[PDB]
């Protein structure tokens, strides 16, 4: 599934949610693999480089969509700033044209993902212990501390429940401002855009709510599980299954944190557009 994001005015990007999770899962496998032994630590330079070459390659496949994406930006530019029928239909076709462009470059995206799976599985396959019945967990401990711990704290320092309460509040206010607002001639083009922006904002809200639930669920699971795989040893097979389980937990957690932030920014970019149209209704036309 695809998520379209408008973080700043004039900027528009998309994410293939399964691809982001897949690419990230293999990043964790690669790192857990090299951190297990002190002799393989120095391979961080080579792993950082390969992952960077894959992200830049994936970005080069989306950068070859930039024409149709900029065409959608211009349609959004007209919609967001009227100061709606054909404009509403214009928006949906340009949106379906972009979605069609992403499906056409599927083979190009899939291969990079497949190239990352091959690299990740290969590093992981090469994971060896001095004594297979007593595998160290220093790698799991180092990886968590250096790639994951700061993200759990970042989430805990923020208040995402308040963020959803503050988002519903803005949605409640626009619903009230639309209803408890005296009707006026020529305001129709603006009333339709507000009702439209509000719907897109309610859709963005539902996504943020869906992702915050995953962040909250995964933050407890990660913190609980990490305690059980940290200051001990495992038989090789158990160590590997334990690394696989953590990578899946990390990948899902990271993905939706990344998406919540991006959708938070898009809810507020579209909120700036509601403030502007309501300002035009009250000041340029005074609709008490």
């Amino acid at each position, epitope marked *: 599934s695809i998520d379209i994001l408008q973080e700043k005015e004039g900027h528009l990007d998309f994410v293939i949610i399964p691809h982001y999770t897949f690419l990230d899962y293999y990043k964790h496998l690669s790192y857990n693999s090299i951190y297990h032994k002190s002799s393989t630590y120095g*391979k961080y330079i080579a792993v950082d480089a*390969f992952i960077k070459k894959i992200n830049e390659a994936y970005d080069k496949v989306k950068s070859k969509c930039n024409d149709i994406k900029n065409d959608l930006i211009a349609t959004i530019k007209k919609l967001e700033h009227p100061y709606f029928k054909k404009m509403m239909d214009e928006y949906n076709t340009k949106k379906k044209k972009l979605i069609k462009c992403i499906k056409n470059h599927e083979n190009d995206f899939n291969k990079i993902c497949m190239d990352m799976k*091959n*690299y990740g*599985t290969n590093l992981f*396959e090469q994971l060896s212990c001095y004594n297979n019945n007593f595998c160290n967990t220093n790698g799991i401990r180092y990886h968590y501390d250096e790639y994951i711990h700061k993200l759990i704290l970042s989430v805990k320092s923020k208040n995402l429940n308040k963020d959803l309460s503050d988002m519903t509040n803005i949605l409640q206010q626009s619903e009230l401002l639309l209803t408890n607002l005296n009707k006026k001639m020529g305001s129709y083009i603006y009333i339709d855009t507000i009702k439209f922006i509000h719907k897109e904002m309610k859709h963005i809200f539902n996504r943020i709510e869906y992702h915050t639930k995953i962040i909250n669920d995964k933050t407890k699971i990660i913190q609980d599980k990490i305690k059980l795989n940290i200051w001990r040893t495992f038989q090789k097979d158990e160590l590997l299954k334990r690394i696989l389980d953590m990578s899946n937990e990390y990948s899902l957690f990271i993905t939706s944190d990344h998406l919540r932030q991006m959708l938070y920014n898009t809810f507020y970019s579209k909120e700036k557009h509601l403030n502007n149209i309501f300002h035009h209704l009250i000041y340029v036309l005074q609709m008490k």
Partner: antibody
Amino acid sequence: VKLVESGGGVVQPGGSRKLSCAASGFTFSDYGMAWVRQAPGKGPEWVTFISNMAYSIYYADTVTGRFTISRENAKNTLHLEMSSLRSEDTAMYYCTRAIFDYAGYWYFDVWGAGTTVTVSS
Amino acid sequence: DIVLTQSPASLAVSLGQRATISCRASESVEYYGTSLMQWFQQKPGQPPRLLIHGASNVQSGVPARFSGSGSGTDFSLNIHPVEEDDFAMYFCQQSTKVPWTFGGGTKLEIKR
């Protein structure tokens, strides 16, 4: 670091053969392994590859469905089960150790002396 | 399938001279800024011996007189200066796409 192939000899057409390869001087389970063959008067031809823990297995289209690579990590042994042998399979069969370079590629660094398989009636 | 075409098929050289042998691939053997071209040496009745792996990476134990260059589809092996033990067969090989392919070979022979 040594690789020793065994199991060669004469096979009649349509016949089968198993080839073994004993590895010494390194941790066998830490490497990908392969069979490469060389027909008399011809260059090397890659036939099959098995990764460290057998997650990845590849075959040449010329061998696909007829040959089976396998490994016994604890016994330092690479195996090659050959099945519907034609005259075209007559070759020196080499066993090779594969290194996974951190730039994301496999290369063969250590090869054994080989074992001859002669497919003739 | 990737077809590696080696040129020349045979090359005669004298002791102390440079020997440059080339390989051309049917399509790019590049994989994320790395050209996956290997070079092997082979003497009669002996298995192939690895010389270069990353198009340019000299294997440990292989002397400094051997060097590799090129990218994409055009690759070359340089031996300078040529020594007595250098007269052998040389093959190139790609590991970018399976089946992993070798070239036909170039025989480096002594001039007399």
